[PDB]
Amino acid sequence: GEDWTELNSNNIIGYWSTGIEGTHKLLSFDEDGTGSFGIYSNATPISFQMFDYKIEEGRIYIYDVYPDEKTPYYLDCKISGTTLKVETGSEAGTYKKQK
Incomplete structure (x- = not known):
């Protein structure tokens, strides 16, 4: 059905956008x-934050x-190549991959 991969320290790597x-x-x-996580409105940046992370679960x-x-905390998510699916969190x- 929805056959997702193991989220790991190597497939997540790169940028991720909506539109x-x-x-x-x-x-x-x-x-x-x-x-790094940013939030925009139309054509202006309105937030920025960064964080370290690990993939230990x-x-x-x-x-x-x-x-x-x-x-x-931890964040439930799935990945398979070019589609991030985060289930919880900000x-x-x-998102689609953006590299």
Whole structure:
């Protein structure tokens, strides 16, 4: 049916977008650095944050965020190549890979 892969430290790597309008959201994850999460409105950047992460459960583990650092938690998500499906969190929805 929906036959997803193991989320791992290598398939997540790169940027992830919805589309370019209204109120969009943008993500990145590096292999040996950090992630980054942005939020826009129409054609202006309105948020930014970064966080370290690990993949120690077939989920994102979040445990360092800035500038307002937050509690550590895990994030249920799926991946197969070019479609991120996050189920929970700020970034919960769908995105396409953007590299």
